[PDB]
Amino acid sequence: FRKMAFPSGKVEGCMVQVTCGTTTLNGLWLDDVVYCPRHVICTSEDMLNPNYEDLLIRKSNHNFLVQAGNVQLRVIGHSMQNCVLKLKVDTANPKTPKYKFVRIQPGQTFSVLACYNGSPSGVYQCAMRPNFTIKGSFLNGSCGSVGFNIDYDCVSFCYMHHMELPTGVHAGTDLEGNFYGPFFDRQTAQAAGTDTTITVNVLAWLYAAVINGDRWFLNRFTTTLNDFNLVAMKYNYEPLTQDHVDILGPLSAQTGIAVLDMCASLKELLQNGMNGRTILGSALLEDEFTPFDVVRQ
Amino acid sequence: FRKMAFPSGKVEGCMVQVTCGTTTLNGLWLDDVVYCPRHVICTSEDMLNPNYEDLLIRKSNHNFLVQAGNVQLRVIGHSMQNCVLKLKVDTANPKTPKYKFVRIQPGQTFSVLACYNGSPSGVYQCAMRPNFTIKGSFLNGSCGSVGFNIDYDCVSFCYMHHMELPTGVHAGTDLEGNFYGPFFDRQTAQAAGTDTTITVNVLAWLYAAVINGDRWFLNRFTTTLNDFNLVAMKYNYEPLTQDHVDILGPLSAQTGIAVLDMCASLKELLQNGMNGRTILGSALLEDEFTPFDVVRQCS
Ligand SMILES: CC(C)(C)[C@H](NC(=O)C(F)(F)F)C(=O)N1C[C@H]2[C@@H]([C@H]1C(=O)N[C@H](C=N)C[C@@H]1CCNC1=O)C2(C)C
Numbered sequence: 001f002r003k004m005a006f007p008s009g010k011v012e013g014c015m016v017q018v019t020c021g022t023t024t025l026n027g028l029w030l031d032d033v034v035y036c037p038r039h040v041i042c043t044s045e046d047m048l049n050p051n052y053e054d055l056l057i058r059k060s061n062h063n064f065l066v067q068a069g070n071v072q073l074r075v076i077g078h079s080m081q082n083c084v085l086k087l088k089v090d091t092a093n094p095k096t097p098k099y100k101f102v103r104i105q106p107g108q109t110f111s112v113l114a115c116y117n118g119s120p121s122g123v124y125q126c127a128m129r130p131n132f133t134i135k136g137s138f139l140n141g142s143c144g145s146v147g148f149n150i151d152y153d154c155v156s157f158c159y160m161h162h163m164e165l166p167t168g169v170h171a172g173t174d175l176e177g178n179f180y181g182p183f184f185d186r187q188t189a190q191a192a193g194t195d196t197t198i199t200v201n202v203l204a205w206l207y208a209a210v211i212n213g214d215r216w217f218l219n220r221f222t223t224t225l226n227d228f229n230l231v232a233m234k235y236n237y238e239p240l241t242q243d244h245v246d247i248l249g250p251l252s253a254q255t256g257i258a259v260l261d262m263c264a265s266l267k268e269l270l271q272n273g274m275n276g277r278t279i280l281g282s283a284l285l286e287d288e289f290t291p292f293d294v295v296r297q
Numbered sequence: 298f299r300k301m302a303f304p305s306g307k308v309e310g311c312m313v314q315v316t317c318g319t320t321t322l323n324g325l326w327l328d329d330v331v332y333c334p335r336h337v338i339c340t341s342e343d344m345l346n347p348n349y350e351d352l353l354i355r356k357s358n359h360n361f362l363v364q365a366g367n368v369q370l371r372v373i374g375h376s377m378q379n380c381v382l383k384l385k386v387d388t389a390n391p392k393t394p395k396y397k398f399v400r401i402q403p404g405q406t407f408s409v410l411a412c413y414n415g416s417p418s419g420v421y422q423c424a425m426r427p428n429f430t431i432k433g434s435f436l437n438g439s440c441g442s443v444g445f446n447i448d449y450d451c452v453s454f455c456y457m458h459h460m461e462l463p464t465g466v467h468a469g470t471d472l473e474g475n476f477y478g479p480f481f482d483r484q485t486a487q488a489a490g491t492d493t494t495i496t497v498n499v500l501a502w503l504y505a506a507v508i509n510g511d512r513w514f515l516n517r518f519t520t521t522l523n524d525f526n527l528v529a530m531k532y533n534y535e536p537l538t539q540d541h542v543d544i545l546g547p548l549s550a551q552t553g554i555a556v557l558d559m560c561a562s563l564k565e566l567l568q569n570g571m572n573g574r575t576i577l578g579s580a581l582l583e584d585e586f587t588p589f590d591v592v593r594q595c596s
């Protein structure tokens with residue numbers, strides 16, 4: 001049972017390089033539009049305190065250098081949508097997949113295609129944390145890298161990368177340019193709210209451990225949903241809803257372990273610890289696999 | 298610090314499906330040849346005790362259904378090379394990348410593009426274990442999925458998937474059909490050997506921690522490679538080779554910590570434990586990041 005990303009080819013064909021002045025990052029080329037973080041228009045000094053509408057009105061189409069491979073695409077128009085810039089180019093991307101823009105929920109997962117200078121570097125799986133950060137792997141020039149899910153050859157873009165917080169976690173926007181979380185694209189110290197653990201995902205992962213022959217954490221006990229949520233809240237876990245219980249149905253039916261019985265197991269894990277034992281090779285409770293992730297794998 | 302697979306697009310454009318009778322698996326389409334596990338020619342009953350030479354004699358080109366999506370590629374020739382079949386087709390794949398076939402050593406990592414019916418399903422990083430198994434994630438119909446590394450636009454194919462052992466780990470071949478480890482493509486009781494920890498990768502992980510400022514474990518001692526190798530095996534760690542010492546060269550230069558000094562630091566970790574302290578936020582020493590993986594992620 002591995003953290004598994006979606007095949008990235010459909011997204012690789014969409015990555016381009018965007019330069020304004022001496023600022024360079026990645027863009028996403030779909031049909032005849034390139035989407036990229038708006039702070040590409042910023043000088044270094046601008047980023048410390050930008051007034052984006054005022055900075056953008058002072059730019060011309062010819063200030064935007066867009067490169068796809070070695071081929072320059074001419075910008076023929078531009079607009080700003082929240083924190084994303086939409087550059088109209090004079091060429092349609094022939095490799096545009098069927099796609100949609102979606103805004104995801106805390107706890108959902110997605111694949112990230114990390115890119116530098118318009119070129120793909122690596123692919124990995126991420127989750128939207130409850131505090132709306134993501135634990136990514138992003139370096140200088142990675143902005144404009146996107147997160148996505150793939151469903152029957154349709155790419156659902158959900159994330160575009162903008163910033164790294166001092167704790168090393170990452171913040172970004174949906175493809176309408178609205179940040180996930182209370183963050184904003186100004187270079188100034190920003191802390192995230194206290195994070196919590198995605199309970200439904202921990203349970204899905206415990207079910208994965210049982211589907212793969214590991215049962216040592218199970219117990220003969222049971223619990224009510226309300227009594228479980230009291231202990232979960234005490235340990236900085238998110239509430240478990242009845243919708244969550246229903247979503248875990250196929251995993252419980254597959255294993256014959258009632259959801260509330262697995263909750264009792266997690267409650268004992270939380271109160272007793274793991275005592276140096278491991279689950280699927282992990283020394284800690286893993287919360288970045290959704291129920292759908294477990295089933296698909 | 299997390300596992301990061303290579304972008305998989307160059308390999309996606311090479312995946313096809315291969316069916317013989319009712320057995321369907323994946324194949325790799327490069328130029329005008331499709332590579333796939335030879336057991337595609339087996340009936341389920343054949344798999345229990347196959348004579349591949351005799352079974353291939355009773356097959357002709359017209360018994361092979363190669364499809365790119367739902368589009369058939371006409372087979373014009375077939376031959377067996379060790380445990381892989383090579384089907385010559387009448388069309389050169391226009392998506393063929395620059396590529397090489399390489400045989401990897403234990404400890405080396407690679408990305409796996411898991412495929413079903415020729416359709417890519419997911420991508421993840423794997424390490425070749427010292428017992429020549431991989432801790433993969435594969436279901437029915439995954440055979441013929443491949444593992445690969447990429448360097449500057451050249452795809453190095455190193456693994457093709459054939460089978461799952463009773464402990465849930467996986468075994469396969471290089472792209473010349475030669476199994477890694479002492480395994481055979483017969484459905485018969487087989488078992489992964491005892492495994493060991495990939496020492497060179499643990500050292501790479503310690504260098505990664507030092508680079509990021511987590512360096513409490515650096516000690517004031519040193520050792521010789523021979524001395525270290527003899528003690529390491531007492532803890533089920535692999536001995537180091539001359540090649541291992543040299544591939545740690547760049548991380549050693551970057552940090553200023555000599556390879557043998559880091560070896561002495563590891564030996565102290567093995568002989569006395571971590572004392573509740575973590576390294577890169579982990580209580581366990583990670584052994585599936587190569588020195589290249591550490592440099593790749595930081596660059
Ligand atoms: C890292 C840092 C101190 C610089 C800063 N962070 C904060 O100011 C915070 F604290 F508010 F978050 C920050 O990210 N930026 C400063 C400036 C842009 C952004 C930025 O450089 N983005 C990079 C895109 N190419 C991706 C970064 C690079 C390092 N790793 C990443 O992921 C903007 C907010 C406009």
Ligand SMILES: CC(C)(C)[C@H](NC(=O)C(F)(F)F)C(=O)N1C[C@H]2[C@@H]([C@H]1C(=O)N[C@H](C=N)C[C@@H]1CCNC1=O)C2(C)C
Pocket residue numbers: 322336344435436437438439440441458459460461462463467481482483484485486487488
């Ligand atoms: C596991 C079975 C117990 C099924 C068997 N294993 C052993 O016989 C062993 F125990 F010896 F290994 C086994 O794998 N095979 C039997 C037969 C081929 C192979 C096989 O079905 N390959 C699948 C390719 N599509 C991938 C498998 C499917 C499940 N997960 C996988 O990865 C061959 C050796 C010729």
